[PDB]
Amino acid sequence: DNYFRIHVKKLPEENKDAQGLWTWDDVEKPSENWPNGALSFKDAKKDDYGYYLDVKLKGEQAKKISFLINNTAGKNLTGDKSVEKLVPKMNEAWLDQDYKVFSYEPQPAGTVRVNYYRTDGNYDKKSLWYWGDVKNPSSAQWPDGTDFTATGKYGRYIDIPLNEAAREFGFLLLDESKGDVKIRKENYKFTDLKNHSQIFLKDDDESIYTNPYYVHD
């Protein structure tokens, strides 16, 4: 009943049994009795990315989850971290190896994952035409188009090999079932290819979202 999932890429220290998750702010029972009142990583579950722990929210209207990883004596290993729910349904965050916090699972360096969600459909035959600061620019024969074939958490996706200190890229969402393929006529253009790793798109929405909740900023 109203948990928030915190994913951890790599624990600061070797033994999971000596480490725990100490939480405060909008959680039901803020940790007490430092350091042992923390939520132990001993019983942490694991997925593709690393460990995860689910924390019961003081909620609603729970909006700020603050946390750190500590050890049995008696260090604050990560420094203090906080996540703010972008929307009420935001229910997971990811901590990477440098203890940065994301609203999505971050992908390996030198890639941008382009996520595409359709309210309908369909999906087949949807593809991405892309260019600019990418290893393999669409080429080609208009209008195809790297197919949206893989399925993830946020609709379908394509992983794009970056190159360099990739800065900025452009793309068009394509519906190959059509006489007019473009979905949106005008070129999309994205900068922040350093500051992200995933982008989120949907339907014929003009906006390039930077979180899976399709809210601006």
Ligand X SMILES: OC[C@H]1O[C@H](O[C@H]2[C@H](O)[C@@H](O)[C@@H](O[C@H]3[C@H](O)[C@@H](O)[C@@H](O[C@H]4[C@H](O)[C@@H](O)[C@@H](O)O[C@@H]4CO)O[C@@H]3CO)O[C@@H]2CO)[C@H](O)[C@@H](O)[C@@H]1O
Ligand Y SMILES: OC[C@H]1O[C@H](O[C@H]2[C@H](O)[C@@H](O)[C@@H](O[C@H]3[C@H](O)[C@@H](O)[C@@H](O)O[C@@H]3CO)O[C@@H]2CO)[C@H](O)[C@@H](O)[C@@H]1O
Phi/psi at 18 (5° precision) = -90, 0
DSSP letter for 44, please.
-
Q: Which residues are at the interface with ligand X (CB under 6 A)? A: 22, 24, 30, 34, 68, 76, 80
String of contacts with ligand Y for each residue 72-111, x by CB under 6 A: ----------------------------------------
Q: How far is the CB of 102 from ligand X (least distance, A)?
A: 21
Sheet holding 150-152, edge to edge: 150-152, 155-161, 111-117, 198-202
Q: Which of residues 168-207 bind ligand Y (CB under 6 A)?
A: 187
The C-alpha atoms of residue 115 and residue 94 are separated, in whole angstroms, by 17
Cα 72 to chain centroid, rounded: 30
Q: How far is the CB of 129 from ligand Y (least distance, A)?
A: 6
Q: Which two tokens stand for residue 162?
A: 């970056």
Q: How far is the CB of 217 from Zn ion (least distance, A)?
A: 8
Distances in Å between the alpha carbon of 161 and those of 60, 131, 167, 188?
40, 11, 13, 18
Per rule CB under 5 A, count of chain residues that contact Zn ion: 7
In 3D space, the residue among 156, 173, 158 whose CA is nearest the CA of residue 207 turns out to be 173
String of contacts with ligand Y for each residue 117-156, x by CB under 6 A: ------------x-x------x---x--------------
Phi/psi at 43 (5° precision) = -105, 20
Which of ligand Y, Zn ion, ligand X, none sits in contact with 149, Cβ below 5 to 8 A by type? none
Q: How far is the CB of 207 from Zn ion (least distance, A)?
A: 13
Binding site for ligand Y (CB under 6 A): 129, 131, 138, 142, 187
